[PDB]
């Protein structure tokens, strides 16, 4: 963890080696990650600064303490703080933020307790739509949410049919398993392979999931899903790989 925050990038590391955090840095401010006495700050502007994911364990969530800051009238104030969760794969990563506290609107130098969980972004070598293999592929990995890091992802993609489906299992905060309904595989603006569809409780629609394909042969998937139970929105980080 400490090494990921201080040590530089080397080829000898088990990939994904480098990860950019632009989507986790709000209001053109800074993000500071801290773990095991180490610290690193990320500014919204530059894309050259990145997290050394090569030092982190593969197929596991790495937890760093986070603080999102903004500069106002010479003074720098804390926008939010909590736990930064990173799930690492060989060619991909899923970033989620467990917000514990936000800036006190009445006393800006202080903080108020407000809990929210957001899947803020992804990272890795995206699969080009023209790099899709033939036939089918199966993916297995993690599903994680607010105080729920042991869910499982099962996912199948028919490349010929340009379609995928799957399931999220073992999420304690969710009454049923979440069905990842049959969805269309499309090319996005950068010609990368993506899937987006419905999340269900059996046949009943509850939200949306979307996945991006990673690696030159679509070895991995990484994305996010939502479940709406009444008025509460549950955000879920999902990532899998071909076994």
């Amino acid at each position: 963890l400490a090494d990921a925050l201080t040590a530089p990038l080397d080829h000898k590391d088990k990939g994904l080696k480098s990860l950019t955090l632009e989507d986790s840095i709000p209001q053109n401010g800074t993000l500071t990650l801290s773990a095991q006495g180490a610290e690193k700050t990320f500014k919204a502007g530059d894309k050259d600064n990145s997290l050394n994911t090569g030092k982190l364990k593969n197929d596991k969530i790495s937890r760093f303490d986070f603080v999102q800051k903004i500069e106002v009238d010479g003074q720098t104030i804390t926008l939010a703080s909590g736990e930064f969760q990173i799930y690492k794969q060989n060619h991909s990563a899923v970033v989620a933020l467990q917000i514990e506290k936000i800036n006190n609107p009445d006393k800006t130098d202080s903080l108020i307790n407000q809990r929210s969980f957001l899947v803020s972004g992804l990272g890795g070598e995206h699969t080009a739509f023209n790099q899709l293999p033939g036939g089918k592929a199966e993916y297995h990995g993690k599903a994680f949410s607010s105080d729920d890091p042991n869910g499982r992802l099962h996912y199948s993609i028919d490349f010929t049919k340009k379609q995928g489906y799957g399931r999220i299992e073992h999420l304690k905060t969710l009454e049923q398993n979440v069905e990842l309904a049959a969805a269309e595989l499309k090319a996005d603006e950068k010609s990368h392979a993506v899937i987006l569809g419905d999340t269900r409780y059996g046949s009943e629609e509850k939200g949306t999931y979307h996945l991006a394909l990673f690696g030159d042969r679509a070895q991995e998937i990484a994305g996010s899903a939502t479940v709406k139970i009444g008025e509460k929105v549950h955000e879920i980080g999902i990532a899998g790989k071909q076994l």
């Binding site: 209001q27 401010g29 996945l211």
Partner: peptide, 26 residues
Amino acid sequence: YHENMRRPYFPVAVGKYYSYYCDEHF
């Protein structure tokens, strides 16, 4: 958030929702 993934799937049906952020000063 996840603009690139979500963009090719519009329009969305009634009941659909997405996470969004606000810029500096907002």
